RNA sequence: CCACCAGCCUACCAAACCCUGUCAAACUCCGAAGGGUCCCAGGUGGAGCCUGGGAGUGAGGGCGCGAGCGAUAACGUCCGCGU
RNA sequence: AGAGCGCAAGGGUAGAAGGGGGCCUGACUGCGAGGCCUGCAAGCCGAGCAGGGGCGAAAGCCGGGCCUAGUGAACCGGUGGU
RNA sequence: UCCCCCGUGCCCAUAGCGGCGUGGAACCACCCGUUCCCAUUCCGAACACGGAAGUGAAACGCGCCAGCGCCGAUGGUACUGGGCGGGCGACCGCCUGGGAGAGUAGGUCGGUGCGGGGG
C-alpha cells in the first residue's frame, strides 16, 4: 500500500488518461520484471495484494522492488445519496499507470520463480502485463 | 600614534621572528592585525530599560569609548524577546586603540581570573582569527567591586588579515598571548 | 574615536603587587593592579 | 554597491559621468544614449593643478568653457559614491547652471 | 564485431521502420550524417554488445567503419528499439560505461544476501587505444549493510575514472519472507 | 472604524476644509496640519467636528 | 564505557547531500499545436460600417473531441470550441 | 534571492516596493487629453495645464500606502458654509 | 592608423565561479595624517578633507586551464491544427502540414561602440 500522509489537496479532479509511460520501463534496479498493458489507475489495495501474492508464494525471497508510487485520492461519494450537493471522498488511493511502465520488479531469485512469481502477481492486478528479463534496457537514468 | 609597550615591541619584535621563520618576503602581504570588536550580549534585556544598558556602557566606558547596543533579530518565545532589540552589546577597535586594549588585556587583566590556568589553544577559526569568552567583568584592571551587580562576561571577537593557525598563533605570543600548553 | 561625549583618554600607570611600573594609554588616570 | 543607477535618477535626462579616484579627477560630460561624452577634464590627467579641491574648481569652470564651445547647457554631476562634499566647483557655474 | 550499415537519404522514419530497417544517425567531432541497420542481426549483435563491446559497420560506401553506440530511443508503446545512436570511434581518451562483473560470494551473500546490482556499466575515461574488458569487482569478502564502491572496483592499468567515486557500485540487502506479515500490522 | 472614526479639517483665518480620518486610539491628540483652502495660497488648518 | 571530555559499534530511527528511478489541475528550468492582435495584400458579398422604426429571443436538444461532476455508470447533469 | 514587503493567495520586487536617519504633510485645488472595462450604471488609468506647497546641491518626485479585498445609486434628513 | 591603462557604454551567463600567471614607468588600489570639510545608533572601517615614504599581497586589468557553472546542434519520438476510420467504452490506427523538451556530438571562461592619457 504507502501513500503520503499529508500531501496537497484533499480532493482532486479524475483526469484523462491516454498513454506514453511517460518513462520508466527500463530497470537499473531488478533483474525480471513487470510492465503494464492498459493505461489505468491501479489500487494500492492491489498494489498491496500483488506485494503479498508475490513474496507469499516465494517465502525467504529476495528482494522486490517498486519503482511506481499510489499517489492518487479517489473521490468516492457515500452509499445511495443523491446528486449535487457535494463531491467524493479521500477513497481509492491508487496510481496513475499507463502501457509500457515497470509497475515492479524481481532480482536474487530463480528463473522459473521470478517467472510463476510474477506471474501470479500481474494476475491479480487490474488488468494483464508483461513479464521481462534484463538486455536492451541497458542505459536511459 | 600612540605608542604603547605591545605596540613598540610589535614594530620590533614581530618582523624578526616573524619574517624570518615564517618567511614573507612581501612587504604589505606580511598578514597582521585587524579589527577587534568587543561584545557582551545577554539576553536579559527582556526589559530593565537601558538601566539595563546602563551596565552595557559601564563596558565601553573600560576601554575608553562608547558602544552600539546591536540587538536581536527573531521571535523567541521561550526566553522572551521577539522582534529584535534587546542586548547585544558591541563596539569596534582599530589600530592605536586596540592596541590599549590589548595592553591592559595581557598586561594586568590576564593575571586575575580565578581559573588563568592558560589561554583557550582550541578557540580557532581558521581564518585568522580567534574568538573566546570569560566569567568575570571586573577581570580587566579599571573596574573594581564598587560597580559588580553579579555575573558580566564578555565575548572578546577579534580578526586578522592572518589566514592559517600559526601565524594568527605566534602573532598572538610576539603580542603576548599566553596560551595553555 | 570621535564625537564629543566618548568619556576621553589619559595616561595611567599600573604599580603592582611586585613592583612593576607599567605605562598605559587609557580611560581612568590611576590604574595599578596586580603583575 | 551604490550602482542603484543613481544614473537611473539621472536616465531622466543628460549626464556628467566621472570618477573621483586618488590622484586624479576624471570630470566628463557625456551625451549618453550611444554614450558619446563630449566634454572633459581632470586634475593631472588634464596637465592643470596638484590639488583635487582646487582643480575641481579651475577645473569645473575650465570644463564649462569647453561645454559653451559646443552650445552646451544642463546635466547632472553622475557619481554613485559622490557624496556631494561639491567639490564647489560642483559643475554649476561650471556651464550647468548647475545647482 | 561485424554488422551491416546504410547510409539514410532522408526518406520519412515511417517507411524505413516499416520495411525492416532500423533507423538511427551516427557522427564523429562535426561530421553528422544519418543511416540505417537491420533490425535482427543488428538485435542479435547488440545483445552481445550495447556500449560494452563494439561494433563494426561494414558499409556499401567503398568504406567499413565502426561505432560504439550512444542513446537509444524506444517506442515506449509495447516495448522495443526503434532508433540508435552511434558515436564513432577513435583514440583519444572516451568516456563510457564498462561493465563490472561481479566476483565473490562473501557473508551477504551465502548467509541470505542480495547483490545490489547499482552499477554494471560505470563511467570511465579510457583511452580508445586500449579496450578493458571486463572489470573484476573483488566481493569476495563483503557483508548485508556493507557496500562496495568509489576505488574498489578494478582500474585496469590502461583505464582511468571520474565518477565520484563514492558512487556505490554494489552491496547486500536483507530477504523477506512471511516475517512481512508481521510488518503487516 | 469608530476608533480611527471620521473627522474634517477646517482652516483657521475663517473656515475652509479638506476631508480627512483620523485614529484616536493611536497617540492622537489635536492637530493642526499644515494645508491649503479655497481662498489663497497654504497656511494653518485646524482640527475640529465629527 | 569516561568524565577537564570522549571513544566505540549494529540484519536501528532519521535532518541534509549524492546516486537510483519517480509522480503532479491549483508544481513549472523549457515549451509546442494554435489563438490573439495590428501592418502591407488580395477578397463584390443578403460582407461590412452609421443612424432610424418594428420585432421576436432569453427551459433549448443531440453528436464531436477538450475538462468538471457521477462510479473514467445514466437517452445523467455542467461548461467550452464545433456542428 | 529560499528574507522582508500589515493582513489570503497570486503576481512581483534587493538596479527596491525591503530596512535606518533628516525636513515635512501632494489622503493638494481648479481641470483633464486620450485609453482600460462594460447592457445600463459604476468601477479602473493618467501625461500635461494652472495656483501654490514639501523636500531635493541639482536632475526631479509628489492628485497617500508595491498592486489586486477593507465597499452601498437614489429617495429622508442631521451638521458647517455659500 | 594601432599598443596598454583609466573614466564608460552596449550583448545578456558560450559573458559567471574558481585554479593559476602577470603589471604598475602615467594610472588604479592599498597605503598615509586625522589638525581642516565631514560623518559612523560603535569604528577615519564607511564618506571624508589634506598627503610624503612605500607597496603591487589584498582591489583590479590582461592572460592560461572546463573542474563547477552555462549554451546544445542532428537524427528520431512526444504532443498538436486540418482531414479519415477502427473500439461496448478505457481508448488505438492512418494521411497532410506544424514540431518540443530529454539527452548524445560538441561548444564556451568572453563580444563590443564613445571619451581621455601616455608610445
Given at each position: ?37 492498459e ?9 498491496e ?29 457515500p ?41 501470479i ?14 538486455d ?6 | 600614534?600612540?605608542?604603547?609597550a ?21 612587504v604589505?602581504?606580511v ?20 538601566i ?15 558602544p ?21 552589546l ?26 588563568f ?24 584592571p ?34 603576548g ?5 | 574615536?570621535?564625537e ?32 | 554597491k ?77 557619481r ?15 556651464a550647468?547652471?548647475?545647482? | 564485431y ?28 562535426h ?37 560504439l553506440?550512444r ?15 552511434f ?36 563511467l ?54 512471511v ?7 | ?37 479655497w481662498c ?11
Amino acid at each position: 500500500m504507502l501513500m503520503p500522509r499529508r500531501m496537497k489537496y484533499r480532493k482532486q479532479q479524475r483526469g484523462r488518461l491516454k498513454g506514453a509511460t511517460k518513462g520508466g520501463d527500463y530497470v537499473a534496479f531488478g533483474d525480471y520484471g513487470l510492465v503494464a498493458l492498459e493505461p489505468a489507475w491501479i489500487t494500492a489495495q492491489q498494489i498491496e495484494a500483488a506485494r503479498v501474492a508475490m513474496v507469499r508464494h516465494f517465502r525467504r525471497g529476495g528482494k522486490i522492488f517498486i519503482r511506481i508510487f499510489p499517489d492518487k485520492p479517489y473521490t468516492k461519494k457515500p452509499l445511495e445519496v443523491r446528486m449535487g450537493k457535494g463531491k467524493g471522498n479521500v477513497e481509492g488511493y491508487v496510481a496513475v499507470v499507463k502501457p509500457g511502465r515497470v509497475m515492479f520488479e524481481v532480482a536474487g531469485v530463480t528463473e522459473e520463480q521470478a517467472m510463476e512469481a510474477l506471474r501470479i502477481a500481474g494476475h491479480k492486478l487490474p488488468i494483464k502485463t508483461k513479464i521481462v528479463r534484463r538486455d536492451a534496457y541497458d542505459e536511459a537514468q | 600614534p600612540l605608542d604603547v609597550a605591545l605596540k613598540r615591541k610589535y614594530y620590533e619584535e614581530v618582523r624578526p621572528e616573524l619574517i624570518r621563520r615564517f618567511g614573507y618576503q612581501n612587504v604589505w602581504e606580511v598578514p597582521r592585525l585587524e579589527k577587534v570588536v568587543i561584545n557582551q550580549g545577554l539576553g536579559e534585556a527582556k526589559e530593565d530599560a537601558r538601566i539595563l544598558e546602563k551596565a552595557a556602557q559601564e563596558l565601553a566606558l573600560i576601554t575608553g569609548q562608547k558602544p552600539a547596543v546591536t540587538r536581536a533579530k527573531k521571535s523567541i518565545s521561550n526566553f522572551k524577546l521577539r522582534k529584535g532589540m534587546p542586548i547585544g552589546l558591541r563596539v569596534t577597535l582599530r589600530r592605536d586603540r586596540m592596541w590599549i586594549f590589548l595592553e591592559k588585556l595581557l598586561n594586568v587583566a590576564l593575571p586575575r581570573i580565578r581559573d588563568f590556568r592558560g589561554l583557550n589553544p582550541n578557540s580557532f577559526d581558521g581564518r585568522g582569527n580567534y574568538n573566546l569568552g570569560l566569567r568575570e567583568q571586573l577581570i580587566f584592571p579599571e573596574i573594581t567591586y564598587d560597580m559588580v551587580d553579579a555575573l558580566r562576561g564578555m565575548d572578546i571577537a577579534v580578526v586578522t588579515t592572518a589566514e592559517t593557525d600559526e601565524e594568527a598563533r605566534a602573532l598572538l605570543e610576539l603580542l603576548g598571548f599566553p596560551f595553555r600548553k | 574615536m570621535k564625537e564629543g561625549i566618548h568619556p576621553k583618554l589619559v595616561p595611567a600607570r599600573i604599580i603592582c603587587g611586585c613592583g612593576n611600573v607599567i605605562e598605559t594609554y587609557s580611560t581612568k588616570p590611576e590604574i595599578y593592579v596586580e603583575v | 554597491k551604490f550602482r542603484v543607477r543613481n544614473r537611473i535618477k539621472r536616465t531622466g535626462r543628460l549626464r556628467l559621468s566621472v570618477f573621483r579616484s586618488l590622484k586624479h579627477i576624471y570630470a566628463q560630460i557625456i551625451d549618453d544614449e550611444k554614450g558619446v561624452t563630449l566634454v572633459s577634464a581632470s586634475s593631472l590627467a588634464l596637465k592643470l593643478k596638484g590639488n583635487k579641491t582646487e582643480v575641481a574648481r579651475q577645473v569645473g569652470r575650465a570644463l564649462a568653457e569647453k561645454a559653451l564651445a559646443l552650445g552646451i547647457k544642463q546635466v547632472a554631476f553622475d557619481r554613485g559614491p559622490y557624496k556631494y562634499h561639491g567639490r564647489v566647483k560642483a559643475l554649476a557655474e561650471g556651464a550647468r547652471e548647475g545647482g | 564485431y561485424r554488422l551491416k550499415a546504410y547510409y539514410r537519404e532522408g526518406e520519412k522514419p515511417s517507411a524505413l521502420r516499416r520495411a525492416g530497417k532500423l533507423p538511427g544517425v551516427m557522427y564523429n567531432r562535426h561530421l553528422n550524417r544519418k543511416v540505417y541497420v537491420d533490425l535482427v542481426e543488428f538485435d542479435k549483435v547488440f545483445r552481445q554488445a550495447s556500449i560494452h563491446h563494439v561494433i563494426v559497420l561494414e558499409l556499401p560506401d567503398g568504406q567499413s567503419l565502426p561505432t560504439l553506440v550512444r542513446q537509444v530511443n524506444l517506442d515506449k508503446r509495447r516495448r522495443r528499439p526503434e532508433h540508435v545512436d552511434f558515436f564513432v570511434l577513435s583514440d583519444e581518451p572516451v568516456e563510457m560505461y564498462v561493465p563490472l562483473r561481479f566476483v565473490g560470494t562473501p557473508a551477504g551473500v551465502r548467509a541470505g544476501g542480495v547483490l545490489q546490482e547499482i552499477h554494471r556499466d560505470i563511467l570511465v575515461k579510457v583511452s580508445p587505444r586500449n579496450i578493458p574488458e571486463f572489470i573484476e569487482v573483488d566481493v569476495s569478502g563483503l557483508e548485508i549493510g556493507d557496500s562496495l564502491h568509489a576505488s574498489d572496483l578494478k582500474l585496469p592499468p590502461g583505464v582511468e575514472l571520474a565518477v565520484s567515486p563514492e558512487e556505490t557500485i554494489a552491496a547486500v540487502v536483507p530477504p523477506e519472507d512471511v516475517e512481512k506479515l508481521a510488518e503487516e500490522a | 472604524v469608530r476608533i480611527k472614526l471620521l473627522l474634517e479639517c477646517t482652516e483657521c483665518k475663517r473656515r475652509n476644509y479638506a476631508t480627512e480620518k483620523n485614529k484616536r486610539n493611536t497617540p492622537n491628540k489635536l492637530e493642526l496640519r499644515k494645508y491649503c483652502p479655497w481662498c489663497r495660497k497654504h497656511t494653518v488648518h485646524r482640527e475640529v467636528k465629527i
